[PDB]
Amino acid sequence: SAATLSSISISPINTNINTTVSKQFFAVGTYSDGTKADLTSSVTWSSSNQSQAKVSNASETKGLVTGIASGNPTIIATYGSVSGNTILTVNKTDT
């Protein structure tokens, strides 16, 4: 493909972890051609803390991570030869 990823952007939801539920995030990229596309399926999500969190999702669920509790888990998104790191904060809406 002549066109290449011009920039990397992260879509909702903000950085927050629920009591004990799964949370999915979307990745948006802009091509130098001014075009946009969802790479959530092209990008592989993972966490440094695999012991306190596990990432398991089929091709149709790519982008699903469940975090029991780690205080401060870090999700790393890798796309081909380009990757971006982001920090997720542990915040429960209610007990």
Coordinates of N, CA and C in Angstrom, one line a residue:
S1 N 0.9 -1.2 0.0 CA 0.0 0.0 0.0 C 0.9 1.2 0.0
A2 N 0.7 2.1 -1.0 CA 1.5 3.3 -1.1 C 1.2 4.2 0.1
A3 N 0.0 4.3 0.5 CA -0.4 5.1 1.7 C 0.1 4.5 3.0
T4 N 0.5 5.4 3.9 CA 1.0 4.9 5.2 C 0.3 5.6 6.3
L5 N 0.4 5.0 7.5 CA -0.2 5.6 8.7 C 0.4 7.0 9.0
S6 N -0.4 8.0 8.8 CA 0.1 9.4 9.1 C 0.1 9.7 10.6
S7 N -0.9 9.2 11.3 CA -0.9 9.4 12.8 C -1.7 8.3 13.4
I8 N -1.5 8.2 14.7 CA -2.2 7.2 15.5 C -3.0 7.9 16.6
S9 N -4.3 7.4 16.7 CA -5.2 8.0 17.6 C -6.0 6.9 18.4
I10 N -6.3 7.2 19.6 CA -7.0 6.2 20.5 C -8.4 6.7 20.7
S11 N -9.4 5.8 20.6 CA -10.8 6.1 20.7 C -11.3 5.7 22.1
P12 N -12.4 6.2 22.5 CA -13.0 5.9 23.9 C -13.0 4.4 24.1
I13 N -13.3 3.9 25.4 CA -13.7 4.8 26.5 C -12.4 5.3 27.2
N14 N -12.6 6.4 28.0 CA -11.5 7.0 28.7 C -10.7 5.9 29.5
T15 N -9.7 6.3 30.3 CA -8.9 5.3 31.1 C -9.6 5.0 32.4
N16 N -10.4 3.9 32.4 CA -11.1 3.5 33.6 C -11.3 2.0 33.6
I17 N -11.2 1.4 34.8 CA -11.4 0.0 35.0 C -12.6 -0.3 35.9
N18 N -13.5 -1.2 35.5 CA -14.7 -1.5 36.3 C -14.4 -2.5 37.4
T19 N -15.3 -2.6 38.4 CA -15.1 -3.5 39.5 C -14.5 -4.8 39.0
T20 N -15.2 -5.6 38.2 CA -14.7 -6.9 37.7 C -15.4 -7.2 36.4
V21 N -15.2 -6.3 35.4 CA -15.8 -6.5 34.1 C -14.8 -6.3 33.0
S22 N -15.2 -6.7 31.8 CA -14.4 -6.5 30.6 C -14.5 -5.1 30.0
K23 N -13.4 -4.6 29.4 CA -13.5 -3.3 28.8 C -12.8 -3.4 27.4
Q24 N -13.5 -2.9 26.4 CA -12.9 -2.8 25.0 C -12.6 -1.4 24.6
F25 N -11.5 -1.3 23.8 CA -11.1 0.1 23.3 C -10.9 0.0 21.8
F26 N -11.1 1.1 21.1 CA -11.0 1.2 19.7 C -9.8 2.0 19.3
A27 N -9.1 1.7 18.2 CA -8.0 2.4 17.7 C -8.3 3.0 16.3
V28 N -8.0 4.3 16.2 CA -8.3 5.0 14.9 C -7.0 5.5 14.4
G29 N -6.8 5.3 13.1 CA -5.6 5.8 12.4 C -5.9 6.6 11.2
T30 N -5.1 7.6 10.9 CA -5.4 8.4 9.7 C -4.2 8.3 8.7
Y31 N -4.6 8.0 7.5 CA -3.6 7.8 6.4 C -3.3 9.1 5.8
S32 N -2.0 9.2 5.3 CA -1.5 10.5 4.8 C -2.5 10.9 3.6
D33 N -3.3 10.0 3.2 CA -4.2 10.3 2.1 C -5.5 11.1 2.6
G34 N -5.5 11.2 3.9 CA -6.6 11.9 4.6 C -7.7 10.9 4.9
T35 N -7.5 9.7 4.6 CA -8.5 8.6 4.9 C -8.3 8.1 6.3
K36 N -9.4 7.5 6.8 CA -9.4 7.0 8.2 C -10.0 5.6 8.1
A37 N -9.5 4.7 9.1 CA -10.0 3.4 9.2 C -9.7 2.8 10.6
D38 N -10.6 1.8 10.9 CA -10.4 1.2 12.2 C -9.4 0.1 12.2
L39 N -8.4 0.2 13.0 CA -7.3 -0.8 13.1 C -7.5 -1.7 14.3
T40 N -8.5 -1.5 15.1 CA -8.8 -2.2 16.3 C -8.6 -3.7 16.0
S41 N -9.0 -4.1 14.8 CA -8.9 -5.5 14.4 C -7.5 -5.8 13.8
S42 N -6.8 -4.7 13.4 CA -5.4 -4.9 12.9 C -4.4 -4.7 14.0
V43 N -4.8 -4.1 15.1 CA -3.9 -3.9 16.2 C -4.1 -4.9 17.3
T44 N -3.0 -5.4 17.9 CA -3.1 -6.4 18.9 C -3.0 -5.8 20.3
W45 N -4.0 -5.9 21.2 CA -3.9 -5.3 22.5 C -3.3 -6.3 23.5
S46 N -2.5 -5.8 24.4 CA -1.8 -6.6 25.4 C -1.5 -5.8 26.7
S47 N -1.2 -6.5 27.8 CA -0.9 -5.8 29.0 C 0.4 -6.3 29.6
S48 N 1.2 -5.4 30.2 CA 2.4 -5.8 30.8 C 2.1 -6.8 32.0
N49 N 1.0 -6.5 32.7 CA 0.6 -7.3 33.8 C -0.3 -8.4 33.3
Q50 N 0.2 -9.5 32.9 CA -0.6 -10.6 32.4 C -1.1 -11.4 33.6
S51 N -0.4 -11.3 34.7 CA -0.7 -12.1 35.9 C -2.0 -11.4 36.6
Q52 N -2.1 -10.1 36.5 CA -3.3 -9.4 37.1 C -4.3 -9.1 36.0
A53 N -4.1 -9.5 34.8 CA -5.0 -9.3 33.7 C -4.8 -10.2 32.5
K54 N -5.8 -10.7 31.8 CA -5.7 -11.6 30.7 C -6.3 -11.0 29.5
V55 N -5.7 -11.1 28.3 CA -6.3 -10.7 27.1 C -6.6 -11.8 26.2
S56 N -7.9 -12.0 26.0 CA -8.4 -13.1 25.1 C -9.6 -12.7 24.3
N57 N -9.4 -12.7 23.0 CA -10.5 -12.3 22.1 C -10.3 -12.8 20.7
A58 N -11.4 -13.4 20.1 CA -11.3 -14.0 18.8 C -11.2 -12.8 17.8
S59 N -11.1 -13.2 16.5 CA -11.0 -12.2 15.5 C -12.2 -11.2 15.5
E60 N -13.3 -11.6 15.9 CA -14.5 -10.7 15.9 C -14.6 -10.0 17.3
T61 N -13.7 -10.3 18.2 CA -13.7 -9.6 19.5 C -12.4 -8.9 19.8
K62 N -11.5 -9.0 18.8 CA -10.2 -8.4 18.9 C -10.3 -7.0 19.6
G63 N -9.8 -6.8 20.8 CA -9.8 -5.6 21.5 C -10.6 -5.7 22.8
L64 N -10.6 -6.9 23.4 CA -11.3 -7.1 24.7 C -10.3 -7.6 25.8
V65 N -10.3 -6.8 26.8 CA -9.4 -7.1 27.9 C -10.1 -7.0 29.3
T66 N -9.9 -8.0 30.1 CA -10.5 -8.1 31.4 C -9.4 -7.9 32.5
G67 N -9.7 -6.9 33.4 CA -8.7 -6.6 34.4 C -9.4 -6.8 35.8
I68 N -9.0 -7.8 36.6 CA -9.5 -8.0 37.9 C -9.1 -6.9 38.8
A69 N -7.8 -6.5 38.8 CA -7.3 -5.4 39.6 C -5.8 -5.4 39.7
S70 N -5.2 -4.4 39.3 CA -3.7 -4.3 39.4 C -3.3 -2.9 39.9
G71 N -4.2 -2.0 40.1 CA -3.9 -0.7 40.6 C -3.5 0.2 39.4
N72 N -2.6 -0.3 38.6 CA -2.2 0.5 37.4 C -1.7 -0.4 36.3
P73 N -2.6 -0.9 35.5 CA -2.3 -1.8 34.3 C -1.9 -0.9 33.1
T74 N -1.0 -1.4 32.3 CA -0.6 -0.6 31.1 C -0.9 -1.4 29.8
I75 N -1.7 -0.9 29.0 CA -2.1 -1.6 27.7 C -1.2 -1.0 26.6
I76 N -0.6 -1.9 25.9 CA 0.3 -1.6 24.8 C -0.4 -2.1 23.5
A77 N -0.5 -1.1 22.5 CA -1.1 -1.5 21.2 C 0.0 -1.5 20.2
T78 N 0.0 -2.6 19.4 CA 1.1 -2.8 18.4 C 0.4 -3.0 17.0
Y79 N 0.9 -2.2 16.1 CA 0.3 -2.2 14.7 C 1.5 -2.3 13.7
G80 N 1.7 -3.5 13.2 CA 2.8 -3.6 12.2 C 4.1 -3.2 12.8
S81 N 4.8 -2.3 12.1 CA 6.1 -1.7 12.6 C 5.9 -0.5 13.5
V82 N 4.6 -0.2 13.8 CA 4.3 1.0 14.6 C 3.5 0.6 15.8
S83 N 3.9 1.1 17.0 CA 3.1 0.8 18.2 C 3.0 2.0 19.1
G84 N 2.0 2.0 19.9 CA 1.8 3.2 20.8 C 1.4 2.6 22.2
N85 N 2.0 3.3 23.2 CA 1.7 2.9 24.6 C 0.8 3.8 25.3
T86 N -0.1 3.3 26.2 CA -1.0 4.1 26.9 C -1.2 3.6 28.3
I87 N -1.5 4.4 29.3 CA -1.7 4.0 30.7 C -3.2 4.1 31.1
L88 N -3.7 3.0 31.6 CA -5.1 2.9 32.1 C -5.1 3.0 33.6
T89 N -6.0 3.8 34.1 CA -6.1 4.0 35.5 C -7.2 3.1 36.1
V90 N -7.0 2.6 37.3 CA -8.0 1.8 38.0 C -9.0 2.6 38.8
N91 N -10.2 2.8 38.3 CA -11.2 3.6 38.9 C -12.6 2.9 38.8
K92 N -13.1 2.5 40.0 CA -14.4 1.9 40.1 C -15.5 2.9 40.2
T93 N -16.6 2.7 39.5 CA -17.7 3.7 39.6 C -18.4 3.6 40.9
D94 N -18.5 2.3 41.4 CA -19.1 2.1 42.7 C -18.6 0.8 43.3
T95 N -18.8 0.6 44.6 CA -18.4 -0.7 45.3 C -19.3 -1.8 44.8

